[PDB]
Each structure stands twice: as C-alpha cells, then as structure tokens.
Amino acid sequence: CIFHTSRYPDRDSMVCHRILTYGKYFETLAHDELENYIGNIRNDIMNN
Amino acid sequence: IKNIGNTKSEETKFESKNNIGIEYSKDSRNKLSYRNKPSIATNLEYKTLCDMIKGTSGTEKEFLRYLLFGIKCIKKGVEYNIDKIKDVSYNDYFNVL
Amino acid sequence: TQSIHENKEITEILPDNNPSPPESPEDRNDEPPED
Amino acid sequence: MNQYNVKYLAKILCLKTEIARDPYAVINRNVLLRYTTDIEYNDLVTLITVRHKIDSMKTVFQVFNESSINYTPVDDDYGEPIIITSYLQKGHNKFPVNFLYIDVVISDLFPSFVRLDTTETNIVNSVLQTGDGKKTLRLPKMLETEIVVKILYRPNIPLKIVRFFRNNMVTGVEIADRSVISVA
Amino acid sequence: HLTQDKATVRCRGKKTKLIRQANEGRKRGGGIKFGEMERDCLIAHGAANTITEVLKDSEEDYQDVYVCENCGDIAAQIKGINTCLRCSKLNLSPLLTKIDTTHVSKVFLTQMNARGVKVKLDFERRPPSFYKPLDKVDLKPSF
Amino acid sequence: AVISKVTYSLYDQKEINATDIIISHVKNDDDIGTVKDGRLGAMDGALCKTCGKTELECFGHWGKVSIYKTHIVKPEFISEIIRLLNHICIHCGLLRSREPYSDDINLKELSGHALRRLKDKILSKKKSCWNSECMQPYQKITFSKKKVCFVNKLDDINVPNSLIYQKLISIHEKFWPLLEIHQYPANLFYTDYFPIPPLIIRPAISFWIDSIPKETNELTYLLGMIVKNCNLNADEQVIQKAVIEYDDIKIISNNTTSINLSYITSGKNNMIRSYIVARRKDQTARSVIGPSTSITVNEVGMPAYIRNTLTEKIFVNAFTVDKVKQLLASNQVKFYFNKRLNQLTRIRQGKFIKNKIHLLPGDWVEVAVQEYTSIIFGRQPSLHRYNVIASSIRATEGDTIKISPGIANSQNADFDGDEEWMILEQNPKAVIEQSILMYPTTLLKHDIHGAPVYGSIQDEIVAAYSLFRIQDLCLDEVLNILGKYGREFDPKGKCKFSGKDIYTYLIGEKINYPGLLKDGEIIANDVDSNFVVAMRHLSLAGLLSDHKSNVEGINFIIKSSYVFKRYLSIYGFGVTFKDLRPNSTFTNKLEAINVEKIELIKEAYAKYLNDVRDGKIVPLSKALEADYVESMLSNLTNLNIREIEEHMRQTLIDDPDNNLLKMAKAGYKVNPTELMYILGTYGQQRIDGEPAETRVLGRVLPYYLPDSKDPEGRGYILNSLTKGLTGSQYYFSMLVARSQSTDIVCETSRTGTLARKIIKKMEDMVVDGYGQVVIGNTLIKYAANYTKILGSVCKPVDLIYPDESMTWYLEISALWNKIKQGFVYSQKQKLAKKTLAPFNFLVFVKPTTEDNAIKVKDLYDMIHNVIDDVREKYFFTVSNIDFMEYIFLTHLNPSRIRITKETAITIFEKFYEKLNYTLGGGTPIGIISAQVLSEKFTQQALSSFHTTEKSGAVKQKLGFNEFNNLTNLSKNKTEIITLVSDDISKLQSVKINFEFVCLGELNPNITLRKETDKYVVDIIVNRLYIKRAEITELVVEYMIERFISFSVIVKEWGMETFIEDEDNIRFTVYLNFVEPEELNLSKFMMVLPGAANKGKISKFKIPISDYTGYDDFNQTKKLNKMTVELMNLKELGSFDLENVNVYPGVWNTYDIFGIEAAREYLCEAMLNTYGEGFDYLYQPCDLLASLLCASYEPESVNKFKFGAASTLKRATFGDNKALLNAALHKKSEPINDNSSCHFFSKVPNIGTGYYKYFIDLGLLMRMER
Amino acid sequence: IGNHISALKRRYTRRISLFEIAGIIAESYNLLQRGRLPLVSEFSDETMKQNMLHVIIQEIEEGSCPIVIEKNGELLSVNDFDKDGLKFHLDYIIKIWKLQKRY
Ligand SMILES: [Mg+2]
Ligand SMILES: [Zn+2]
Ligand SMILES: [Zn+2]
Ligand SMILES: [Zn+2]
C-alpha cells in the first residue's frame, strides 16, 4: 500500500465495513448494561 | 544549468516511486557542505578530462564536456545531435476518424 | 437564432429548480482511538 | 550591482534626465523614444551616459554599490551619485535590488504620471471642499518611498500630489490623484 | 403540501419578555422576520424613512425616557422628579435628556455596563440657522 | 435632542460605590438584601420598591456587594495586565529602562516616532534590573488558565493580585503614552465593592406552559453564587473563579454552552444582528404564490383571509374628520389611538367605550385594508434590489398571493410551491417613499447594464415568433387578435394584413435603431427571445423607454403580453411525440454509425498497444496516451453533433411547421446539443475535468477486466435517452448528477458568507452632491459613472476606429492617439470593440437628403463647443471626457450620415437634460454594486456554470473560489508570473533552468552489481525520452553527478558515460558507501530515481506558447509566452531579461510598481473570474478594487485595518471584541454609519436621508385671524 | 481661480433629482396629515373637501411650500432649484400617482 495506494481498499469503500440491524442495537445495549451492573455490584461489595 | 534549489516551502502528485527521492532531496541536512571530488579513475583514454577536471570552471568547462560527448559519439558513429534524430510519429495510430 | 449586436449580448444565469421552502421543526474500549 | 540590472537602471536614468530638463513633463514608456544610452560596466563604478537625440546634450551618471562609495564629479555629471542598496531606503538616488530584478520601465504595469503645477493644485484643492465652511475631502494616499516619487524629485519643489492617467477599458484613459505621505 | 397548512397572517399579538418584540411560531400567532438582506434591499432603494420605521419600536409603544448626560444611566423618577441616583449620590447636577430608542438597545447597553464598559452619549446643539433669498439659476444650454 | 457622539471608557471605583442599595444575603424572608430584592426593579406582579412603577415603566437600578480586602481582576482585561507587566521591574516597580527618568528630555513636545522608539527600547531592554534599589532579575508572569491566579513561568509561584495592583498603580501619569495607557491602571480592578446589575437584563424565565413554575434566570443564579463566597470572607481564588464564570467562562474552560454576560456577543447569534438590524413585525403575512393574467406588473393580488386581518391607518385632521365619524357610525373601525395619552383601544364588536373616543388632530383609527393601498412584498433569498418591491393591492380569489408572470424572472420565482411574504407600513413618509421609489415602473431599467427587468416568458416567446410570421389576415382576424387594444387600429386602405402590421401598430412610434428598427417598423428577419425577454440587449421596451420614459416601456410590456396570450388562445401551441421521433429511420442510422466508429477506435488503440508490447516503438507517457484517446472520442462526439444539425435542417425543409423546431428557432431551450442527448449519444462523463479514477484492480467496476483499457469502462456513454442507458452507463451518469448536487449545497454555504462581507464593506459608499464617489471623508472617484449620469441611462455603443474616408480625419486621429492606451488590454491580446455613450442618442437620429442637412462646419462647431462647455461646467476641468467627443464625431460623421439642424439640437438638448436631472446626491452606488456582484457569482455557482478543465501549464482558474482568493489577499503564497517576449532564447534559458525533471521520469533501466572493492551501477536511458523532456544527455549526466557529489552517504565515487548504440546512453557509477554498508546501499538505491533532479519542484511543466498581440488597432506582432509559479522574483535577478514584459501577482506588483498598479491588477483579475461575456461588470469591479486600495497599502475584505470604521460598525461586522478595546482606549466617535444609525434609531444618510430638512414658519406667522 | 470653481459648484448645486423632491413631499405630507394648517391662497371651507396631495402640489407650484432643505452647505426652498427639473420630476410623479388612484 505504501508503493501502490490507489490499488488498496480505501477507507470509504464498502469492502471494509459491516452493517448493524435491529437486533444488534439491543444486543450491544444489553452487553454494556450487564457490565455496568456487575461493576457497580463489585464496587459496592468492596466499599462495604 | 546553474544552481537552482528547493526548500520546504501547491500540492503535487508524483508516482510515489519517485516521490520518496523527491521529498528526500528537499532536506538540506542530507547534503555535504562542500563538494566531494571523484577518487576512482576512469576514462583512461582521454586527456581532455585533466583540462576539464581543474582550472576550467565556466562556459569553457561546458564547451569541453560537450566536445568530449561529441567525440565519443563520433567514434561510436552516431548522430551526436539530438535535434537531428527522428522521433517516431504516433498520429499513424490515432488518425482513424 | 440570428445575430444583430452580438458583442453587446447579455448572458442569462437562472437556476431552473430551487429548494422548497422550509417547514417548522415541530468503558469496554470497543472503539478505535481515531488518531 | 551586476551586468544586467544596470541595463534596467539606465532606463530609469532617462526619466530622471527628462524630469531634470522639465519638472512638469508627463512620464511613461514613450519618453524613452527621445533618448539613447551608453553603458560601461565595472564591479566598482559603472558609467551610464544619457544623450538627448534632438539636442545632443549629455548627462553622465556614476553608479556604486552601497558598501563602497568613491564619488568625484566628472564632466557633464548629474551632480550626485547613484546608489544600489540592499533594502528600501529614503532618498531619490537610492534604489534597492528589489526594484531591479526585471526591466521595470517597459512593463505594461508601469504607471503614467505627472506633477501638478500651482494652478492645477489650486483647482484640485478647490474641488475637494464640501461647501460647508472649510471642511474638505481627502485624496487616497501613497508612500514617499515608491519609485514614482523617486523619479519625480526636485530639490526646491516639494511634492504633495501626484496625478495618474489610468488605463480604462471603456473610456480609454481616466484621471486620478494621490497624496504623498512621509515615512519615518 | 397543502395551501391552508402554510398560510399565515398577524395583525397584533404577544411579545417576548426580554426584548419586547413580536413572538415566534405559526401556531402561537407569531410574526414574520424582517431579515438583514431585506434591509439591504431597502437601503439599495434609497428609502431611508421606510427602513427607519421598520426597524423602530411601534409608535403606539412610545414613552418618556430620560438619560443622564454625565454617566449614561437611565434616570429614575422618584415622586415625579427625574433624578440620576449615581450622580446625585456624588453631589452633582447633570443634565437629563429625552431619548427615543428601542428597548433592545437599552438592554444591550445595560449588559455592556454590567461587563464594566461605560457608554456615554452626547447631543447636538447646532446654533440656529436662518433662510436667505437666493438668486435665480437657469441651467439650460444656449440654443 | 439629536444623538451625535458616543464615548467608551471604564468605570471608576467611586462610581461603582455610589449606591445606597447593598446586597448581603444569599437568602432572606422577603429577598431583602438579596440579589433578587425589589429595590433593584419591578418584576412579575410587583411594583419597584425604588420608583414605585410597573415593569413597563421601570428600567432598573444598581446595587453593590462588599468584598473584604480582596482585589479582583476584570476578566476581559486579564491579558491587558500581562501586557503591563513586561514594561516594569516587578520587585522595585520601576520601568525596565532609565532614559525616561531624565530631566534633559521633555515628552510633551514629542510624539509618534520618538515615543514608539523609546517604547521599543524599553521593551527590548529585558535584562536584570539596571537600578541598584533591588537589583533583581525580570520575571515572566502569566495567567494559569487552570488555577484562577497569575503564576510565574520560571517558578510555579502564585502572585497575589494585591502585589500586581500595588506595582501597577505606582506608574506616573507622564509615562502613560509610552505604555499606551489612557485612564488608570486602578480601573482594571475591583477593590471595595462589586456591582450588582438591575433586573431589566434578567427577568424570570417562563415557559410555553403557564402551569409550569418559572425557572430562575442563569445570570441571577451566577450572581447569587458570587454573593455566596463574598460574606464568607474567603480567599481571592474562589471569588475570582465565581466572577470569571459569571462574566466569561471561556477564559479558563473550553465549553461554549453556558450562559453568561458575554453570551450577547458570542458568535453569529449576536444580539445586534438578530434583533437590531433585523426583527419580527406585527402587520405581516406569508403564503404560496400563483399566476394571474388580470394583474399587471404594477399590482399584487391579496387573498381574503389576509384582507380580513390586516388593517390600515387613517389620521384625524380637518380633511378626514367627517369620514372617520361616518366609519365609527358604520361599525367599521377596528382600532383607535389617542396620541395625547399614547393609548391604544380595540373596538370589540358588541362591546366598546363611546365616551373614551374624543377625536383630536394627531390621533388615528384603523380599519380593514383597502384596494390600491401599497404593500411591500418579496421572495427570499433577497439577493438584489428587485426581490423586495411595493405594489398596489387588488382583491383576488383563493388563499394564494397572485403575481403577474412579468415579474417572475426578476425574483427568480416559479409556481411549483414557492412562497412570498408581505409587510404593511403606514407612516406617511414611508407611504410617499413606497409610492415613488419602490414602485415597479420606477425600477424598469437595470442599475448596471440598463436592460429592462420585466418581460415575457416561456410559450409567450414562441407566440411572439409566430405572430411576426403570419401573413394573410382579414380585418376581423386582426381585430380578434388585438382584442381590447383594437379600438384605435387604423386600416388605412388595405384589405389584407400581416403580422408586421400588428407589430408596427404595437410600436406606436417612428424611431430608428441600427439592426432592429427603421421608421418604427422591424427590419430584422425574425422576432426571438432577445426582443421580448427580460435582461436582454435588444429589448423593444428598452428602446421605447430610452426614447421617452419608463411609462411607455411598461405600457408596451403590458400590451404586448396581452396580445401574445390572445394569440395563444386563438391558435394554440403544443409539442407532441411525433415531432421528436416520427419513425425509427434516423435514430437507427445514427446508432449504426456509433456502433461502427467505436469499434474502429478500439481496434486502433489495440494496434498501438500491441506494437508497444513488442519491441517496435517506445511507449508514450500516460498523459499523452490519454490525450490521444480523448481526441478520438471527441471527434466521434463532433460527428454526432454534425449529424444532428443536418437532420434539423432537413426536417425543417420537409416539415416547416414542426413545433419543436419552432422552439429552437425562437430561441427557447432547444439546441443541437440537447437533441444529441435525446437522439444521438451521451458522450464522456467527467469529474473534476477528468474521467473516473481506477480503484482496486486498475478498474472502476468489476464488469471490466483488471487493468482494462476499454474507454466505455471509464465513462464514455454510447447510448441515447430514446435508446435507454444500460446499468453501467447509468452509474457514470448518476455519478455526475450526485456530485453536482453535493457541490451545490457546499457552494450555497460559502457564497453567502462572502456576499455578506462584501456588502458590509461597500455599504457606506455613496454619490455626493457634486457627482463624485466618496466613502466617509475620502474621495474615491471624480465622476460617478465616468459620466455623472445615472448608470441605467448610459448606453454601450460601437467603437469606430480611425479611417481616412471620414470627414474630420485629423481631429479624430488626434483624439484616438490621446485615448488609445486603455483600448488594448489583457496582456496585449484583446482590442476593445465598445465604448460608453452618455444616453443612447441613436433613437433620435434620422437621415436626410444632403440638401436639408446641417453644414459640416456648423455641426463640427456645435459638437466641439458643447463638449468644451460641459467639460468646464459639469466636470470642473478635472476629468477627461474625450471619449464622448470621439463618439459624437464618429457616429454623426457626415461621410456616414447627414442630418438636419433640428435633429442635432434635439440630441444635444437631451444630452443636457440627462446631465441635469438624472443622478442625484445620496445614490447608494456601493451597495448596488456589491449586490450585483454577489448575485452574479451566487447564481453562477448554483447552476454549475463553470466547468473544470485539465491543463499542462499554470493557469488562473474561474469561478467563486478564485474571486474569494483575490478578495482575501493572503500573503506568503506562490504567485503566477507570466513572461512575454519576442526573442525566444531569453525564455528558453529560464525554461531550461526552472522546469522540473527527475531521473525517474525518463524511465531508466537501473541495475546494480558488486565487484571486489566497488559497487557498479548502470543507468541506461533511451534518447527519445531525453528529447521529449527537452534536455540534453549532458543535462542528465549533470543531474546524476550533482546528486552523487553532495551525498552524505557516499564515501568514494567515480562516473563514466558510454554510447550503447544509436538510441541508448549508459551512465556507469562506481561507488563505495560509508558504514553501515548494506543499509546505506539500500537507502541509496531507494532514493536515486527521485533525488537526481534539476529545476523547481512543481506539478506543472513550462511550455512556451505563441500568440498574436496588438500594438494598435492596425498593428500586430507575434509574441512568445511562458508562465511559472514563484514566491518572489529574486531568482530571476541573473537571467538577462531585457525587453521582457513581466506580469506578476498582486503583492509582487505592489512591492515593485506601487499601489495604483496593484489596484489595476485587482480590477482586471476580479473581472476575469466571471467568464467571457460579462464586460458590463467592469464598473462594479473597478469600484471594489478602488475600495481595497484606498489606503497606501492593499487591505483585505476580512479586516478593518486602515479605514477609520466606528466601533459599532466593527461590532455589527462581527468583531466581538470591538467594544472592549474601544473602552480600553477611551474612543470617542460620531454616529454616521448605517450600523450606528440603526443602533440608535436614526435615519441613515442614504437616499432621501442624505439631506436635512427644516420648516420655515415665516409665512405662517405673517397670517392673522 | 478658486472663486471660479466655487461659482461653478454653486451653480451645480441647483440641479434636482428624485430623492430631493420625494423627501420634500414626504415631510410636507407628514406634517399635513398630522394636522398643520395648509398655506394655499383662497383658503376656505371648500379647501378641506379636496385631496391632500392636490393641496401639496398647489402649495409647491404657487411658491408657499414651507419646507427647507440643506444640500451643499446652503439652505434652499423648493423654488430655488432649476424650474425645468422640478417640472420634469413632478410630471413623472403625477403620472404614476394617477396609475395608483392617488391623484
Ligand atoms: Mg420553485
Ligand atoms: Zn448620572
Ligand atoms: Zn424602579
Ligand atoms: Zn528593580
């Protein structure tokens, strides 16, 4: 890519991206909220 | 040709196999402060070099080196004047329509 | 078209289509740093 | 000073000769048609001889670098040395190298200008008054260090207004005026 | 896109509290905004009085307001007497003069004062002038 | 009673203390002593405890809070304090020099240079304290911006504000001018008290729901927070931080959302430019528009729902009292105003007050708006003057606002959903101004180019074209066409009539004009768009207006539009599908032609590629190969164009009544290119002037093989619209379309910003009372339009060069020699064809038969004497008007035409009328010019008028971007320098020494090998590449040798050259590198192709071209030309450029030639940015340039550097710091600018406001009852 | 030579344009609308039955217009301007006013 830049997939090309559908929003939010929940429980136990 | 230089002062688009060297040549830190003279002997069949290699440092030097090139061409048997060489015409390919 | 005083002609510049008027409004470290 | 910029300076030292002959003459490229020049170059002192065709009168200019000045008047001398400086400075006989990279006088961008006499100055001052007491308008400004001011210099005639004959695409020529402001 | 969903008109209505200008909103009976490009056009016509009247407060909202020529404060009215509190506290007797400006100008100036900038206004007292008869002028050519 | 001057400064500490209202508590039972107490002003449902008045009549009062021995810095001026700590010794408090402390020098009798030099010396001292009182080093204090305190850079030690205050207040008055101090350093701090502002600027915040409790104002909350830390007797940091976050939080933080004092002047949403120079209004409306044939250009149709809400005013006076009483009796009055009490009353139906209505002079009543009242209306955006006009009201049906199609073009309006807005202003002065100045009949002729702004559109054009051609009509048919205008038609003795007769009747005037008219009859072959459409140069209404007045022109427009629409009603018009494609013969033929030719082109290209792939020819460069292919494709497109033109001609022969070809002939929207798109081919699609670029496998789409050379694979479309594009062709078409839309959005954003800046800059430039152009107190131009005549009245006319057949040849040649300098321009490659006549005298010219004519001598004397008289009496002997005399001597030359004495007298009487009546003081010429320029470049940007092109040499671009660059006037950028000569050797030297070439460009054959004690590098070059680069073999040798000689990674080297054969050269290099060996070997082999070069690095080559230049109208020469980009001209100083004409950029030309040359350059370049046929824009550009060069140095449009712009003007422009600096410097200014007048509700010094009005009571007081 | 230029400029001051006459009419009309006394000859109760713009034009034409304008450091009444220019502009204004149903 250093020597032939135009022949390497560009950052705006669809070749190098994937797309999120309806269910993926819910999946990611569930992941993040569960992690925050467990973190808060750990912090409370440590403080107690 | 006289000494016209460049410094890190519009955008350019070179082939990137030449751009590396082109941008390397823009840094004054990559050049010696004084010329480094030749040390490996060559062109043993000529004494005009001794005339050119020292003393002559003006238009005479340019004239002498052009003479040397012409002498080499004459010995080889070539035109030695680039203006008198024929360039291939490509209009024969693209004259359709 | 014909030419009469071509050296004094005036060239028209007018868009054909224009935009319609407006309407009232009415950490998991899971992202690249993006340097 | 070098072997090329002296040829450019020789043309400025024909407009200066014309102004010496007549302080109210119009200055532009065409003036050069009435003069001839001879140049003798040397790294220490260059000699420029300006000759008026009809009169055959001579004027001799001696040109020196700023660093080394050794001036002694000669026959038909202009009466003052011509100095080439490294940077712009005040003085009608001092010219920076910046002015002499190209043949300035014959460029299409060289102006056409003249000095106003007393009658024309009075008319201009009268036109500028607003008619309400002594209030007046002001002309646009130009610096004293421009080459135009250097060319139009006389020891005993202060220069306050310069008139320009602008090229105009629809009327041919247009008249404008500027006032000269001093530089400290 | 239906005509009766876009039509609007205002005669009189509510004002905004801070600046006392016509409110905004089609559903709330707001007024159309006279922008500065329209102002440019009016100036290009040469209609000075028209633009002056457009940009001013309504003639029906006028009231007497006095300003102190010394410090620029709006004079208070105590027991029917116009007084500058700041200058009176300093034992001074400055002139109080009537002004006819917009409310938004007063708000802007007061805020600038709050930031520490003092704004003082002077007034023109040109000496009286008299009309004199003038000789006649024709201006026609000689034909 | 007239505000005339404004002064800014800072408050003294004693002034802050002068108040009896002390605030102490953050809370209290009744807010007494709090930041919300009622003594500071009235509030919701509460009278003011100070003056005892309601909110509508109380403007608030000031208070103070106590600070206990805590010195407080004023945030805005924090930086100022830093500036004052670099001129004194902190420890001993003395200046950083000793010269000021000398009695031998008195500063009173000296200023400017002396003070500035002394200040420079004092600042440059910067050394350990000279005096022995303390003998301490000088520190460097700065505001931390994280901790609210000043700290020393050398040592992180907090410096208390008390020390800084004590040191600063010690400076004596006599040294203030040296340090640029005006009032007092102590004015930069608060010491004993802090002010508390009134309640007017911080009323309780409400919401759209009445139930929701009102929330506290942010300013009040911040003031309470300040008060919280005051009585606590805390440190200075807490109070300082509270004050900073109350005033301007951005001083320390970086969030731009909190509300504080500075919010009023934050950004684009200033209080000035949202509520002072703009505002919402009461009597306004807005609605969708539609057309109407019953409304003339002077009128506007108002719907019922608007007529039933808006109201108009009737003033009570002796003339109207009875009418007002009748209206009150009839229940028609909606509002009443008592002027003596300033009281407004609404007359509700069924409920109102009778005794309260006592009508006295000066009162007024308001009733429903009536027909023929003037109203102001327009369509946004308001790009130029004609978007906002005042017209007479007519009652119409529906809920839409109706306009005549005759004004649609001037507003850039159509009827696919557009809306327009209305406002009603009823002040009597405004009424008169609306009735005269803003009336459409007064606006007929465009301000700059003078063509009418109203006319016909669309199918009317075709109607006009057809009407002129109809031949055999009886009287009944003529009268049916003429309709209500047929009453006065005169059938002299004829029984058959033509369309020419109808046109002659419509033009009821016997006038001549070369080309169009002879004795009032059209002598052109046809009537087309240029005769009847707005903004066109052959308008008939324009000639009629020039002959008499705007009333006649408007009448002709109305009447001709009516008759054109009657023609449409009687005969009809419509295009069908059969008009476009009766059968498939022609399209099939053209399709076959395209199919054959494209294959021929592909075969030729394949032959070339195959020959290169073998050893039969050296390949071309990429650029040249692309150029050859492009040439072949362009030839194919031109063949298609020629076929379409032949088809149009043949169809016209066979089917003379084809309606599509009628549209083409009349000059409306149809031409060979559009028909080629429909029936022929689409051609090449381009982005940024080139075909689409390859992206992955050397291709654009996977429909083509890797590294494909098929032109169709890079955007050449073969199909037409009737055939239908394929999917891949559709891709390229949509690429172009979508790029255009995106660019439109971006350009819409940028053009508005530039337009606003230009308008603000030029707003105050007007014509004075003597016909001169002035701004402020500076004379910009002696004669307003070169003529001291209204701009719309002057007329461009042919420039007739001297000829020996003319009558007064000597005088004419002398005048030409006097004025010719400006008629050769654009680097000597253009000759002017037009000049400017004062008023279009041609419509008054009539030939005569050589014996009733005026004698030659008398005519010459008349012209000469008139010109002399006008020269002295109207131009005061200063301006040059030789061009007027030249125009009169050439266009009325007896060898060209003979005229009677009466004709000449009429012409010159009209000349004097134009000189006397048309141009008046107060004309806003600057803003008109700004609007014209801005509207033009905006419309050109939004229509994609300019198309990018690829070039091999340096060129100056067109369009908005270049104009913006010119107005910015940025420094420290490369400029395009043009060199022109007649001897080509001088240019060739510069070319050889400046054009960039590198070894890699020559396609060498570098190889390397290692031998005992050496590395051998062979570089083989083909001579043809050397020849194409336009250099010699020794140039290549020198490049290589110069690179190797100065390399820092080469230890030992040697070179030799060999002639391999008739067409190859081998350069051999023997090398030994420095340690490390192999690493440096790899680096050398990597950088060799690009490092061995000569010339100035740039992306452009330097070809030398030839053209033909003018010396005069009859002298021509052949000139050579080249261009190069440079920072300055120093490098040229040693190249023998004698007799070489040099054209540099703006800053270089200013530095060498002066300010006048810079002005000329700017004017010409700005004009060039617009394109080819826009010469009429010369006058506006000339003004803008003159403004940018009004001082002794050029000045950008982004700044106010040399002009003495007032503080309020700068603040309106968007400075955001102007008021603070003005207060710091104690500036006192007059009130003359438009912005300043708007701020204080004064009448601007524009138009009617340019004069001052008085009333003479003498005659009233001489009358006795 | 200064006096000659001054005299020429004083003569130039007497020419009249649309802005000046429009301003004069606007001032006079505002004053009349708000209730000043008309200054026409033969003033009587029949004067109050006429059109106000007719009254303003009559005052201008018979030389009793009370408005005074300051132009180039001088104070001019409407009758100090060039007569033909005043007639020219008034004719145009009356035409367009008639088109508007005002006059
Ligand atoms: Mg539309
Ligand atoms: Zn006060
Ligand atoms: Zn109060
Ligand atoms: Zn010290």
UniProtKB/Swiss-Prot annotation, chain A:
In which compartments does the protein localize?
Virion
- Tell me which family the UniProt entry assigns to this protein: Belongs to the RNA polymerase beta chain family.
Spell out the subunit comment: The DNA-dependent RNA polymerase used for intermediate and late genes expression consists of eight subunits 147 kDa, 133 kDa, 35 kDa, 30 kDa, 22 kDa, 19 kDa, 18 kDa and 7 kDa totalling more than 500 kDa in mass. The same holoenzyme, with the addition of the transcription-specificity factor RAP94, is used for early gene expression.
What function is annotated for this protein? Part of the DNA-dependent RNA polymerase which catalyzes the transcription of viral DNA into RNA using the four ribonucleoside triphosphates as substrates. Responsible for the transcription of early, intermediate and late genes. DNA-dependent RNA polymerase associates with the early transcription factor (ETF), itself composed of OPG118 and OPG133, thereby allowing the early genes transcription. Late transcription, and probably also intermediate transcription, require newly synthesized RNA polymerase.
Q: What is this protein identified as? A: DNA-directed RNA polymerase 133 kDa polypeptide
| Full-protein interval shown | 341 to 388 of 1164
UniProtKB/Swiss-Prot annotation, chain B:
Induction of the gene? Expressed in the early phase of the viral replicative cycle.
What domain of life is recorded for the organism?
Viruses
Localization, per the record, is: Virion; Host cytoplasm
Give the protein's biological function.
Answer: Part of the DNA-dependent RNA polymerase which catalyzes the transcription of viral DNA into RNA using the four ribonucleoside triphosphates as substrates. Responsible for the transcription of early, intermediate and late genes. DNA-dependent RNA polymerase associates with the early transcription factor (ETF), itself composed of OPG118 and OPG134, thereby allowing the early genes transcription. Late transcription, and probably also intermediate transcription, require newly synthesized RNA polymerase.
For this chain, the family text in UniProt reads: Belongs to the poxviridae DNA-directed RNA polymerase 30 kDa subunit family.
Q: How does it assemble?
A: The DNA-dependent RNA polymerase (vRNAP) consists of eight subunits encoded by early viral genes and termed according to their apparent molecular masses Rpo147, Rpo132, Rpo35, Rpo30, Rpo22, Rpo19, Rpo18, and Rpo7. The same holoenzyme, with the addition of the transcription-specificity factor RAP94, is used for early gene expression.
Name used for this protein in its record? DNA-directed RNA polymerase 30 kDa polypeptide
Species this chain originates from: Vaccinia virus (strain Copenhagen) (VACV)
The taxonomy runs: Viruses, Varidnaviria, Bamfordvirae, Nucleocytoviricota, Pokkesviricetes
UniProtKB/Swiss-Prot annotation, chain D:
Q: Which GO terms describe its biological process?
A: viral transcription
Any Pfam family hit: Pox_RNA_Pol_22
- In short, the EC number is 2.7.7.6
Intracellular or extracellular location(s): Virion
Q: Indicate the principal place this protein occupies in or around the cell.
A: virion
Alphabetical UniProt keywords = DNA-directed RNA polymerase, Nucleotidyltransferase, Transcription, Transferase, Virion
Where does it sit, as one GO cellular component term? Answer: virion component
Does this entry carry the keyword Transferase?
yes
As its record notes, the protein acts as a catalyst of:
RNA(n) + a ribonucleoside 5'-triphosphate = RNA(n+1) + diphosphate
- Under the GO molecular function aspect, what terms does this record hold? DNA binding; DNA-directed RNA polymerase activity
Keyword Transcription attached: yes
Give the protein's biological function.
Part of the DNA-dependent RNA polymerase which catalyzes the transcription of viral DNA into RNA using the four ribonucleoside triphosphates as substrates. Responsible for the transcription of early, intermediate and late genes. DNA-dependent RNA polymerase associates with the early transcription factor (ETF), itself composed of OPG118 and OPG133, thereby allowing the early genes transcription. Late transcription, and probably also intermediate transcription, require newly synthesized RNA polymerase.
Give the record's subunit note: The DNA-dependent RNA polymerase used for intermediate and late genes expression consists of eight subunits Rpo30/OPG66, Rpo7/OPG90, Rpo22/OPG103, Rpo147/OPG105, Rpo18/OPG119, Rpo19/OPG131, Rpo132/OPG151 and Rpo35/OPG156. The same holoenzyme, with the addition of the transcription-specificity factor OPG109, is used for early gene expression.
The family assignment reads: Belongs to the poxviridae DNA-directed RNA polymerase 22 kDa subunit family.
Question: Know the name of this protein?
Answer: DNA-directed RNA polymerase 22 kDa subunit
> What is the name of the gene encoding this protein?
OPG103
UniProtKB/Swiss-Prot annotation, chain F:
* Source species, domain of life: Viruses
- Keywords in UniProt for this one? DNA-directed RNA polymerase, Nucleotidyltransferase, Transcription, Transferase, Virion
**EC nos:** 2.7.7.6
Catalysis performed (reactions): RNA(n) + a ribonucleoside 5'-triphosphate = RNA(n+1) + diphosphate
Pfam families named in the record: RNA_pol_Rpb1_1, RNA_pol_Rpb1_2, RNA_pol_Rpb1_3, RNA_pol_Rpb1_4, RNA_pol_Rpb1_5
Report which residue ranges the record marks as coiled coil: none
EC primary class: transferase
Q: Which family does it belong to?
A: Belongs to the poxviridae DNA-directed RNA polymerase 147 kDa subunit family.
Q: Which PANTHER family match?
A: DNA-DIRECTED RNA POLYMERASE, DNA-DIRECTED RNA POLYMERASE III SUBUNIT RPC1
| Quaternary organization | The DNA-dependent RNA polymerase used for intermediate and late genes expression consists of eight subunits Rpo30/OPG66, Rpo7/OPG90, Rpo22/OPG103, Rpo147/OPG105, Rpo18/OPG119, Rpo19/OPG131, Rpo132/OPG151 and Rpo35/OPG156. The same holoenzyme, with the addition of the transcription-specificity factor OPG109, is used for early gene expression.
Name the chain's protein: DNA-directed RNA polymerase 147 kDa polypeptide
Q: Which gene carries the instructions for this protein? A: OPG105
